[PDB]
Symmetry: D2
Subunit: 68 residues, 4 copies
Amino acid sequence: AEPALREQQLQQELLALKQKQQIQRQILIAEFQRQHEQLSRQHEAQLHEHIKQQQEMLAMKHQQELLE
Amino acid sequence: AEPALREQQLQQELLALKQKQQIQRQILIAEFQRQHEQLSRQHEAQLHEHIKQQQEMLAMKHQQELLE
Amino acid sequence: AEPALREQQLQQELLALKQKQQIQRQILIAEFQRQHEQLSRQHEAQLHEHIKQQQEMLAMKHQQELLE
Amino acid sequence: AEPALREQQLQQELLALKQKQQIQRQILIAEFQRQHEQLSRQHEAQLHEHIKQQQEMLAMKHQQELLE
């Protein structure tokens, strides 16, 4: 056999290509989910950090007012 | 002034935060678009690469069979 | 001509396919950027909405404490 | 209790918000993974469709050339 073989080799190669690409897409999406959740938590911490300071601010505006 | 100052300092600090985060999102999306477009073209150059060989395959199959 | 014509037709149909696919990716990224910025701002409007209440909370805690 | 209570209510309401947003991020990424895998397969099906036709094209080019 020969052309029948190369005919069989390409078919399999092609079917192996699809399998490979679908996983790389999963990796690309996984890569991004990570970067995305990462920036999402940071943003969040800055916004919370705001809460833990918008606190002391409005706190000292009265927490000592009783002495001012 | 003073408490009114820290009050005004946080308000601006906040609005500055929003402006900042919204651009980091743009950088995150811009980052991914590039990664995404990158794999998309590779995947494609493999599938095309296939074309340029699934070619020489059926090619020498008959084009040579003619001499056989 | 004829087979040579079908050769040329497929080549053109190929280059045309590439162009179409690249824009669909763009429409896909565009679709996502929108959904992403959209949810991003909501999350934010809940975090701020929190600020505008974590405010009144500690407010009437002291703002009227002068009467308590 | 009361102010101490409204303090506890906000701390919980906050922790609850985080948990909610983190899942909406997941629903957002899941929505996109699907749109992405979906368009990735179509793209592919058009590239294969080109294979299963660039076939016949080069087929009849010779497969009948034996009679042309």
